[PDB]
Amino acid sequence: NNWVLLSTVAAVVLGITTGVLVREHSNLSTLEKFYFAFPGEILMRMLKLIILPLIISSMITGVAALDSNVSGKIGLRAVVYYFATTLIAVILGIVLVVSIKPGSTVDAMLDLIRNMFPENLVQAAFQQYKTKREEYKIVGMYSDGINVLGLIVFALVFGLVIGKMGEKGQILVDFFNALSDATMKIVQIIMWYMPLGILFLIAGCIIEVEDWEIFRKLGLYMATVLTGLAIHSIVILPLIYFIVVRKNPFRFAMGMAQALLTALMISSSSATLPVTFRCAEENNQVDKRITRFVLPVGATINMDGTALYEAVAAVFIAQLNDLDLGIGQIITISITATSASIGAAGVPQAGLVTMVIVLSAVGLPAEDVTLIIAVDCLLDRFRTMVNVLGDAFGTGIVEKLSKKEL
Amino acid sequence: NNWVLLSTVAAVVLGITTGVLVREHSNLSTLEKFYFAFPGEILMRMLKLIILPLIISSMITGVAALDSNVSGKIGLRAVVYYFATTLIAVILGIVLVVSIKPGSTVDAMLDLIRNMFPENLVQAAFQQYKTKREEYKIVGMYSDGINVLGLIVFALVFGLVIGKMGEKGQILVDFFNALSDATMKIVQIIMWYMPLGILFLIAGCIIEVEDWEIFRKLGLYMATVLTGLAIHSIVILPLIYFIVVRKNPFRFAMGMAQALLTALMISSSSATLPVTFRCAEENNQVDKRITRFVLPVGATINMDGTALYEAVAAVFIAQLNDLDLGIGQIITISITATSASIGAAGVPQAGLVTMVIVLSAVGLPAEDVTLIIAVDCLLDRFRTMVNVLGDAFGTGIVEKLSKKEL
Amino acid sequence: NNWVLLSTVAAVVLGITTGVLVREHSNLSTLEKFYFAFPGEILMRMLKLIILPLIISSMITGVAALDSNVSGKIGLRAVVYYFATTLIAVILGIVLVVSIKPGSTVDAMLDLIRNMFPENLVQAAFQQYKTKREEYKIVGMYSDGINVLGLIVFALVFGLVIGKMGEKGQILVDFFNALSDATMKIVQIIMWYMPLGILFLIAGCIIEVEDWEIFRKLGLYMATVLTGLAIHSIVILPLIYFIVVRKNPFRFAMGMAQALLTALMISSSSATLPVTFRCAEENNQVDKRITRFVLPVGATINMDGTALYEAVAAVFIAQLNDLDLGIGQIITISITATSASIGAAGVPQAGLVTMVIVLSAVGLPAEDVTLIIAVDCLLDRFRTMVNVLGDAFGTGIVEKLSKKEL
Ligand SMILES: N[C@@H](CCC(=O)O)C(=O)O
Ligand SMILES: N[C@@H](CCC(=O)O)C(=O)O
Ligand SMILES: N[C@@H](CCC(=O)O)C(=O)O
Ligand SMILES: [Hg+2]
Ligand SMILES: [Hg+2]
Ligand SMILES: [Hg+2]
Ligand code: NA
Ligand code: NA
Ligand code: NA
Ligand code: NA
Ligand code: NA
Ligand code: NA
Ligand code: NA
Ligand code: NA
Ligand code: NA
């Protein structure tokens, strides 16, 4: 029948039950807790393995698919929508976190421009650049971690160039089309192992909770993120959809119910891409030419909930450490969180590796992620839902704004 | 005429003569000894350069060549034979080494599963993952050394996916076919320099022998390995060949005499692949469709003598250090040695870099390889012979077991 | 109209004016000086990003374009001319620097052979090998920095192999042709940002001059380099051109005036390749089949002024530190400087990273590059001009020596 989401629902309920029963009926040491969540670790190792070919091939094929005369218009209509919706999300998150109050920046601002143009393509696949001043002179070095931001820019430029070359460069277009669909097939292969991995990934996640006092203390912060996500998903996005196209926005969401449920269960926007494609094309009746570009490109660039969570978490951690923020310190968080959303891949544990940059932007230690790591999975489950909903709503907007070219 | 093996025989006899005459008539320092064996070092740098494209392209083309309906059957018939023959070799080696007696394991057991699914494809080409516990919590880091095990798994999955896609993904099949045959051409180019490199590689190998007391002390251990190789090559493999196909097993070996001699002289199963192909196809009259898959895939996965040597050497080093082994400690050696055979490339100095993992599995320092490094080349010369003989015997077995599909 | 060089001339004059006016009218700290030259840093990050695909694809396509029967002859006629002209340049530089007098080698000599055959293709793209002796035994390790020398050799061998395979390996030829022209398109895209980057790259270069006493002290050394470049560009190259082909050498230079001006303004031989192509083909009326091979291959291998500058700077730094040089110490500089010219890419700051090897060849600290870093841009501007002039003159020589095969 349809085991794609039934198996995942069974896995998540079994994971919750197993974690609760084990944590209570037993007292395991930290080493045994680490050994317990090994299958989830293997699932995460596979998901992180698949991202690089996925991102590179998806960007290249999405940009090169557009004809030379329409690449500018459709690309602009997509990028403007992405930037506007993410800025709205960041502003809403900052405003809400400031109102509720749950609790060397230039170097980090220039490091973002330095990482858009890496010095080496091979090294950018597994290493990232960072500079720190010392005596005052600037010293730069390469740390570990894939440089998604530079690879995305290079892939966009390469796709545009190959699309402009035409029949002479058609061989590269064919090569990257085949590579992208091979990567999609490999992701479909991983979806078989996904449920058993998710079971342990959540069971061992609800086991490390030492006393629930962490859950009580992280209260109010969790409400701020959930309220921001609800406002951005139920109010702002349907409103901007209705403004562009005069259609009932909620019928679109109801048609994208399967994709939303899959995203909320697996917490990965890149692995739910086929379901989103099917729901958008077969049900909502969206043109293929534009969705084939909006979906794969926006599955890792357009992440509104991720940006909102980055801004809210950064300001909350700052408030936990005092360090009253000025107006200028608000802005550097807003811009960095926008880059952090673009710099994170469609995998669960993403959004924590990219939060180090936004934390160091305002001069904070990298170890403060542990202040909120405890309950991050529950918020990730809801971040992914709005990350894919934004992509779906962008699809209808671009389609309505591209009627004259179809 | 036929200079492929005549030149190699001349090179090996000249190397033995040169090493003996130099070591005796002269007293060189360690720096001069290092400078003496420079051409062998260059040959090894070239052979290690060629392995990565060779392995990747060979696995991809071998798996994608099979049709979608026959890929499962032939692949299963090959992998079952590989696993069974290697397990037999490991068991025989362990039994012999235990009888003759010449003299934190869970982390190393899970590192093997962690290395089958690397977190990065580019980083897996030159780096490997390892975890060590410290206070107890697990800390992981990436050391140097190509991750052959993860690349093999990814290449197998990619080849299966591309074979299933068909005419749409035929461009990748063509690309990797061309890449594989280009790599074979480059290996044929290196075969010109091979003889002069081998001359110094053995001359400087028989020079570092300080007093022959090392040869006397390593006695009994060398007998255990040679007896195990002889038993596995003369008895077990012909018997399992005769059981499957009712033909004289020794006629097959006699037809593969040129390949066996080349493997025994150059000590590299990947560089003797064309000779093995020629001997199996032109003389033994083996079908091309199945040999084109069994030979290149099995030239680095199917290594029986390597696994036997790993097990015997690990147990011998353990006995030199006391540390009486339990039944459980025998098993972790057996499984790790099976992975070590798969994880080693078809190059001479391989089998020593992969022995560090099997030594650390039972909690031993990485510097104990020096206890047997002195006479390792002589045992490598015989390991390669049985490594290629196992591949040849597997070819006839799979062919006889694949008559109905040809 | 023609904004390619008018904009660059405006940028260079504005950069000189801005640097002079700022350095005098203001007293900035070192951190502010570093922040001032940020756009030049971004331009350099982009230029260093583009070199690896450019080099690999250019070598592969240039070698594979030649037919199997003519690849040996044309390749030999090009490589002999390259080696002879570079040796002449090195000898002239050494002679001039010795006459004017402005002021563990075996390990560094064998490291060059070790770097021609790297142990890993992926690691060679961003790392380089070096050995140092310690107690005496040799210990080797990998430092950072792209290994251009090994990649060039592998690309040459791969191109020859693919050209010999023919229609069977034509898919790789097509792939690399498309990749090379895509890289050229990306370089043309970077040429838009080039002028604004050059403005700051020179403005902040003439700002770090502390007191002009450095300019006075570096006098005589600058004259030695300029005189060597003038002699090699005005006398030796036209003479060797006239000897081969009985045509007026200076008419060729006058036709290559646009390319020479572009090279002198942007100080990058790889980014001025399209202009050199246009000037050589449309004006000088050179056959396309031979220029398509001589230009892209020689744009990074044939660098005469770079080698002359390396030799002169190394001997000048040695004379600043006393350390009287023997005849043997002259030779190791000459051979290393020849490799340093081949090992440097067509980017401005190149020639300083490759000078560390030639400085360590004679046993000198790597920090002595700061003795001449102050005025290096002015000498680079003239190095690039002769680097492209040598390529142009080689084109006519090979064409005249290849009449019978066209
Ligand atoms: N879960 C996100 C990745 C980024 C994040 O978790 O913050 C997604 O797949 O859309
Ligand atoms: N000599 C082996 C490689 C592995 C080893 O030496 O143990 C072969 O080429 O088959
Ligand atoms: N500027 C040189 C690069 C090498 C050097 O600067 O020494 C060129 O592009 O030709
Ligand atoms: Hg969780
Ligand atoms: Hg040996
Ligand atoms: Hg300058
Ligand atoms: Na967005
Ligand atoms: Na998304
Ligand atoms: Na992202
Ligand atoms: Na085996
Ligand atoms: Na083998
Ligand atoms: Na192996
Ligand atoms: Na030259
Ligand atoms: Na040049
Ligand atoms: Na060069």
Coordinates of C-alpha atoms in Angstrom, one line a residue, chain C:
Chain C
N1 CA 33.4 50.2 -27.5
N2 CA 36.6 48.5 -26.1
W3 CA 36.3 48.7 -22.3
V4 CA 38.5 45.7 -21.7
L5 CA 41.7 47.7 -21.3
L6 CA 40.4 51.3 -21.0
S7 CA 38.6 50.4 -17.8
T8 CA 41.8 48.6 -16.5
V9 CA 43.9 51.6 -17.3
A10 CA 41.5 53.9 -15.5
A11 CA 41.5 51.4 -12.6
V12 CA 45.3 51.4 -12.3
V13 CA 45.7 55.1 -12.5
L14 CA 42.9 55.6 -9.9
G15 CA 44.6 53.0 -7.7
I16 CA 47.9 54.7 -7.8
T17 CA 46.3 58.1 -7.1
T18 CA 44.2 56.7 -4.2
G19 CA 47.1 54.9 -2.6
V20 CA 49.4 57.9 -2.7
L21 CA 46.7 60.3 -1.4
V22 CA 45.6 57.9 1.4
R23 CA 49.1 56.9 2.6
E24 CA 50.1 60.6 2.9
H25 CA 47.0 62.4 4.0
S26 CA 46.3 59.6 6.6
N27 CA 47.8 57.3 9.1
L28 CA 45.9 54.0 9.2
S29 CA 46.6 51.1 11.5
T30 CA 47.5 47.7 10.1
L31 CA 44.0 46.3 10.7
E32 CA 42.5 49.2 8.8
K33 CA 45.0 48.7 6.0
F34 CA 44.0 45.0 5.8
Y35 CA 40.3 46.0 5.7
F36 CA 41.0 48.6 3.0
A37 CA 42.3 46.0 0.5
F38 CA 39.4 43.6 0.9
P39 CA 38.1 43.8 -2.7
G40 CA 41.5 42.9 -4.0
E41 CA 41.5 39.9 -1.6
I42 CA 38.1 38.8 -3.1
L43 CA 39.4 39.1 -6.6
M44 CA 42.4 37.0 -5.7
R45 CA 40.1 34.4 -4.0
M46 CA 38.2 34.1 -7.3
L47 CA 41.3 33.9 -9.5
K48 CA 42.7 31.2 -7.3
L49 CA 39.4 29.4 -7.4
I50 CA 39.4 29.3 -11.2
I51 CA 42.9 27.9 -11.8
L52 CA 42.4 24.2 -11.0
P53 CA 39.6 23.4 -13.6
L54 CA 41.4 25.7 -16.0
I55 CA 44.7 24.0 -15.8
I56 CA 43.3 20.4 -15.8
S57 CA 40.9 20.9 -18.7
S58 CA 43.3 23.0 -20.7
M59 CA 46.1 20.5 -20.6
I60 CA 43.8 17.6 -21.3
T61 CA 42.1 19.2 -24.3
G62 CA 45.4 20.6 -25.7
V63 CA 47.1 17.2 -25.6
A64 CA 44.1 15.2 -26.8
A65 CA 43.3 17.6 -29.7
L66 CA 46.4 16.5 -31.6
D67 CA 46.1 13.4 -33.7
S68 CA 47.9 10.3 -32.6
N69 CA 50.5 10.6 -35.4
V70 CA 51.3 14.3 -34.8
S71 CA 51.0 14.5 -31.0
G72 CA 54.7 13.4 -30.6
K73 CA 56.1 15.9 -33.2
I74 CA 54.1 19.0 -32.1
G75 CA 54.5 18.2 -28.4
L76 CA 58.2 17.8 -28.8
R77 CA 58.6 21.0 -30.8
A78 CA 56.7 22.8 -28.0
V79 CA 58.4 21.3 -25.0
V80 CA 61.9 21.7 -26.4
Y81 CA 61.2 25.4 -27.1
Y82 CA 59.8 25.9 -23.6
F83 CA 62.7 24.2 -21.9
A84 CA 65.3 26.0 -23.9
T85 CA 63.8 29.5 -23.5
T86 CA 63.3 29.0 -19.7
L87 CA 66.9 27.7 -19.3
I88 CA 68.2 30.7 -21.3
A89 CA 66.1 33.0 -19.0
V90 CA 67.4 31.4 -15.8
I91 CA 71.1 31.5 -17.0
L92 CA 70.7 35.2 -18.0
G93 CA 69.2 36.1 -14.7
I94 CA 71.9 34.3 -12.7
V95 CA 74.7 35.8 -14.7
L96 CA 73.3 39.3 -14.3
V97 CA 72.6 39.0 -10.6
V98 CA 76.1 37.6 -10.0
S99 CA 77.8 40.3 -12.0
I100 CA 75.8 43.3 -10.6
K101 CA 75.9 41.9 -7.0
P102 CA 73.0 44.0 -5.5
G103 CA 73.8 42.8 -2.0
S104 CA 70.1 19.4 2.8
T105 CA 69.8 20.4 -0.8
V106 CA 69.3 16.8 -1.9
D107 CA 66.1 16.5 0.0
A108 CA 64.6 19.6 -1.7
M109 CA 65.9 18.3 -5.1
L110 CA 64.2 14.9 -4.6
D111 CA 61.0 16.5 -3.3
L112 CA 60.5 17.8 -6.9
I113 CA 60.5 14.3 -8.3
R114 CA 58.3 13.2 -5.4
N115 CA 55.7 15.9 -6.3
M116 CA 55.6 15.0 -10.0
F117 CA 54.0 11.6 -8.9
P118 CA 51.6 12.3 -6.0
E119 CA 50.2 9.5 -4.0
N120 CA 46.6 10.8 -4.3
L121 CA 44.8 12.7 -7.0
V122 CA 42.2 14.4 -4.7
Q123 CA 44.9 15.3 -2.1
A124 CA 47.1 16.7 -4.9
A125 CA 44.4 19.3 -5.6
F126 CA 45.0 21.2 -2.4
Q127 CA 48.1 19.7 -0.7
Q128 CA 51.8 19.3 -1.4
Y129 CA 54.5 16.9 -0.2
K130 CA 57.7 17.8 1.6
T131 CA 60.4 15.8 3.5
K132 CA 62.8 16.9 6.2
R133 CA 65.5 14.8 7.9
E134 CA 65.6 14.4 11.7
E135 CA 67.1 12.1 14.2
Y136 CA 69.4 11.0 10.6
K137 CA 66.2 9.6 9.0
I138 CA 63.8 11.1 6.5
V139 CA 60.3 12.1 7.7
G140 CA 57.7 13.2 5.1
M141 CA 54.4 15.1 5.6
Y142 CA 51.8 16.9 3.5
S143 CA 51.4 20.7 3.8
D144 CA 48.8 22.9 2.2
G145 CA 49.0 24.4 -1.3
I146 CA 47.9 23.0 -4.6
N147 CA 50.3 20.6 -6.3
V148 CA 50.3 22.1 -9.8
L149 CA 53.4 20.1 -10.9
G150 CA 51.8 16.6 -10.3
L151 CA 48.5 17.6 -11.8
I152 CA 50.1 18.9 -15.0
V153 CA 52.0 15.6 -15.5
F154 CA 48.9 13.5 -14.8
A155 CA 46.9 15.7 -17.2
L156 CA 49.5 15.3 -19.9
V157 CA 49.5 11.6 -19.6
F158 CA 45.7 11.4 -19.4
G159 CA 45.4 13.6 -22.5
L160 CA 47.9 11.4 -24.5
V161 CA 46.1 8.2 -23.4
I162 CA 42.6 9.6 -24.4
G163 CA 43.9 10.9 -27.7
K164 CA 45.3 7.4 -28.5
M165 CA 42.1 5.6 -27.6
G166 CA 40.2 7.5 -30.3
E167 CA 36.4 7.2 -31.0
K168 CA 36.0 4.9 -28.0
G169 CA 37.3 7.5 -25.6
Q170 CA 35.8 10.5 -27.5
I171 CA 33.3 11.0 -24.8
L172 CA 36.0 12.1 -22.4
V173 CA 37.4 14.4 -25.0
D174 CA 34.0 16.0 -25.5
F175 CA 33.5 16.3 -21.7
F176 CA 36.9 18.1 -21.2
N177 CA 36.4 20.4 -24.2
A178 CA 33.1 21.5 -22.7
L179 CA 34.6 21.9 -19.3
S180 CA 37.5 24.0 -20.6
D181 CA 35.3 26.4 -22.5
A182 CA 33.0 26.7 -19.5
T183 CA 36.0 27.7 -17.4
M184 CA 36.9 30.3 -20.1
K185 CA 33.4 31.7 -19.8
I186 CA 33.7 31.9 -16.1
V187 CA 37.0 33.8 -16.5
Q188 CA 35.3 36.2 -18.8
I189 CA 32.6 36.7 -16.1
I190 CA 35.3 37.5 -13.6
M191 CA 36.8 40.1 -16.0
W192 CA 33.8 42.3 -15.2
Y193 CA 34.8 42.5 -11.5
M194 CA 38.5 42.6 -12.4
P195 CA 38.9 46.4 -12.7
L196 CA 37.5 47.3 -9.3
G197 CA 39.5 44.5 -7.7
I198 CA 42.7 45.7 -9.3
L199 CA 42.1 49.3 -8.1
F200 CA 42.2 48.2 -4.5
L201 CA 44.8 45.5 -5.1
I202 CA 47.3 48.2 -6.1
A203 CA 46.0 51.0 -3.8
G204 CA 46.5 48.8 -0.7
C205 CA 49.8 47.5 -2.2
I206 CA 51.3 51.0 -2.4
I207 CA 50.0 51.8 1.1
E208 CA 52.0 49.3 3.1
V209 CA 55.2 51.0 2.1
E210 CA 56.4 52.2 5.5
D211 CA 59.0 54.9 4.6
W212 CA 60.3 54.6 1.0
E213 CA 63.7 53.6 2.7
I214 CA 62.5 50.1 1.6
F215 CA 62.3 51.3 -2.0
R216 CA 65.8 52.9 -1.8
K217 CA 67.2 49.7 -0.2
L218 CA 65.6 47.5 -2.8
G219 CA 67.3 49.6 -5.5
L220 CA 69.8 47.8 -7.7
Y221 CA 67.9 44.6 -7.2
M222 CA 64.9 46.0 -9.1
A223 CA 67.3 47.3 -11.8
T224 CA 68.8 43.7 -12.1
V225 CA 65.3 42.2 -12.7
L226 CA 64.2 44.9 -15.1
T227 CA 67.4 44.7 -17.1
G228 CA 67.1 40.9 -17.3
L229 CA 63.5 41.1 -18.5
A230 CA 64.4 43.8 -21.1
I231 CA 67.3 41.7 -22.4
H232 CA 65.3 38.5 -22.6
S233 CA 62.3 40.3 -24.2
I234 CA 64.0 42.7 -26.7
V235 CA 67.1 40.8 -27.7
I236 CA 67.1 37.0 -27.1
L237 CA 63.4 36.2 -28.0
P238 CA 63.4 38.3 -31.3
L239 CA 66.8 36.8 -32.2
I240 CA 65.6 33.2 -31.7
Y241 CA 62.4 34.0 -33.6
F242 CA 64.4 35.5 -36.5
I243 CA 66.7 32.5 -36.6
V244 CA 63.8 30.0 -37.0
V245 CA 61.5 32.1 -39.2
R246 CA 63.0 34.8 -41.5
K247 CA 60.4 37.4 -40.6
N248 CA 60.6 40.7 -38.8
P249 CA 60.2 39.7 -35.1
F250 CA 59.0 43.2 -34.0
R251 CA 56.0 43.2 -36.4
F252 CA 54.8 40.1 -34.4
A253 CA 55.2 42.0 -31.1
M254 CA 53.4 45.1 -32.5
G255 CA 50.5 42.8 -33.6
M256 CA 50.5 41.4 -30.0
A257 CA 50.4 44.9 -28.5
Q258 CA 46.8 44.5 -27.1
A259 CA 47.7 41.2 -25.4
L260 CA 50.9 42.7 -24.0
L261 CA 49.1 45.7 -22.6
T262 CA 46.4 43.5 -21.1
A263 CA 49.0 41.3 -19.5
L264 CA 51.0 44.3 -18.2
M265 CA 47.8 45.8 -16.7
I266 CA 46.2 42.8 -15.1
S267 CA 49.4 40.8 -14.2
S268 CA 47.7 37.4 -15.0
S269 CA 48.7 35.3 -18.1
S270 CA 45.7 32.9 -17.7
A271 CA 43.1 35.7 -17.7
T272 CA 44.5 37.4 -20.8
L273 CA 44.4 34.2 -22.8
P274 CA 41.4 35.2 -25.0
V275 CA 43.1 38.4 -25.9
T276 CA 46.3 36.6 -26.8
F277 CA 44.2 34.1 -28.9
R278 CA 42.5 36.9 -30.8
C279 CA 45.7 38.9 -31.5
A280 CA 47.6 35.8 -32.6
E281 CA 44.8 34.4 -34.8
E282 CA 43.0 37.4 -36.4
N283 CA 46.0 39.7 -36.8
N284 CA 49.3 37.7 -37.0
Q285 CA 47.4 35.1 -39.1
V286 CA 48.5 32.0 -37.2
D287 CA 47.0 28.6 -37.9
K288 CA 44.3 27.6 -35.4
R289 CA 45.3 23.9 -35.0
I290 CA 48.7 24.7 -33.5
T291 CA 47.8 27.9 -31.6
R292 CA 44.9 26.0 -29.8
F293 CA 47.6 23.7 -28.4
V294 CA 50.5 26.2 -27.8
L295 CA 48.5 28.9 -26.1
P296 CA 46.5 27.1 -23.3
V297 CA 49.4 24.7 -22.5
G298 CA 52.0 27.4 -22.5
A299 CA 49.9 29.9 -20.6
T300 CA 51.1 28.2 -17.3
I301 CA 54.1 26.0 -18.3
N302 CA 56.1 28.6 -20.3
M303 CA 57.0 31.4 -17.9
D304 CA 60.4 32.9 -18.6
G305 CA 60.2 36.1 -16.6
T306 CA 58.9 34.2 -13.6
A307 CA 62.0 31.9 -13.7
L308 CA 64.3 34.8 -14.2
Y309 CA 62.8 36.6 -11.3
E310 CA 62.9 33.5 -9.1
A311 CA 66.6 33.0 -9.8
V312 CA 67.5 36.7 -9.3
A313 CA 65.5 37.1 -6.1
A314 CA 66.9 33.9 -4.6
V315 CA 70.5 34.9 -5.3
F316 CA 69.8 38.5 -4.1
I317 CA 68.3 37.2 -0.8
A318 CA 71.3 34.9 -0.4
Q319 CA 73.7 37.8 -0.9
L320 CA 71.7 39.9 1.7
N321 CA 72.3 37.0 4.2
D322 CA 76.0 36.5 3.1
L323 CA 76.2 32.7 2.7
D324 CA 78.5 32.9 -0.3
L325 CA 77.3 30.5 -3.0
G326 CA 79.3 27.7 -4.6
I327 CA 79.0 26.5 -8.1
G328 CA 76.8 23.6 -6.9
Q329 CA 74.6 26.0 -5.0
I330 CA 74.1 27.9 -8.3
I331 CA 72.9 24.8 -10.1
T332 CA 70.2 23.8 -7.5
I333 CA 68.8 27.3 -7.8
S334 CA 68.7 27.1 -11.6
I335 CA 66.9 23.8 -11.7
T336 CA 64.5 24.7 -8.9
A337 CA 63.7 28.0 -10.5
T338 CA 62.9 26.1 -13.7
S339 CA 60.4 24.0 -11.8
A340 CA 59.1 27.0 -9.9
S341 CA 58.1 28.7 -13.2
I342 CA 56.2 25.5 -14.3
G343 CA 54.7 25.1 -10.8
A344 CA 53.1 28.6 -10.6
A345 CA 49.7 29.4 -12.0
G346 CA 48.7 32.4 -14.1
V347 CA 47.6 34.5 -11.1
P348 CA 49.2 37.7 -9.6
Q349 CA 50.4 36.5 -6.2
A350 CA 51.8 33.4 -7.7
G351 CA 55.6 33.3 -7.9
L352 CA 55.8 34.0 -4.1
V353 CA 54.3 30.7 -2.9
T354 CA 56.6 28.8 -5.4
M355 CA 59.7 30.9 -4.2
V356 CA 59.6 29.1 -0.8
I357 CA 60.8 25.9 -2.5
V358 CA 63.7 27.6 -4.3
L359 CA 64.6 29.5 -1.1
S360 CA 64.6 26.3 1.0
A361 CA 66.7 24.5 -1.6
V362 CA 69.8 26.5 -0.5
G363 CA 68.8 26.3 3.1
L364 CA 67.1 29.6 3.8
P365 CA 64.2 30.5 6.1
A366 CA 60.8 30.8 4.4
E367 CA 60.3 34.3 6.0
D368 CA 62.9 36.0 3.7
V369 CA 60.2 36.6 1.1
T370 CA 59.2 39.7 3.2
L371 CA 62.6 41.2 2.2
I372 CA 61.3 41.8 -1.3
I373 CA 57.5 41.5 -0.9
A374 CA 57.2 45.3 -0.7
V375 CA 57.7 46.0 -4.4
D376 CA 56.7 42.7 -5.9
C377 CA 53.7 44.0 -7.8
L378 CA 55.7 46.3 -10.0
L379 CA 58.0 43.5 -11.0
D380 CA 55.0 41.1 -11.5
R381 CA 53.4 43.6 -13.9
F382 CA 56.5 43.2 -16.1
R383 CA 56.9 39.4 -15.5
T384 CA 53.5 38.7 -17.0
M385 CA 54.2 40.7 -20.2
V386 CA 57.3 38.6 -21.0
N387 CA 55.5 35.4 -19.9
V388 CA 52.8 36.0 -22.6
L389 CA 55.4 37.3 -25.2
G390 CA 57.3 34.1 -24.9
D391 CA 54.2 32.1 -25.6
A392 CA 53.4 34.3 -28.6
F393 CA 56.9 33.9 -30.1
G394 CA 56.8 30.2 -29.5
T395 CA 53.6 30.1 -31.5
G396 CA 55.2 31.5 -34.7
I397 CA 58.3 29.3 -34.2
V398 CA 56.3 26.0 -33.9
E399 CA 54.0 27.1 -36.9
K400 CA 57.1 27.8 -39.1
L401 CA 58.6 24.4 -37.9
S402 CA 55.2 22.7 -38.6
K403 CA 54.6 23.9 -42.2
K404 CA 55.1 20.4 -43.6
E405 CA 52.4 18.9 -41.3
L406 CA 49.7 21.6 -42.1

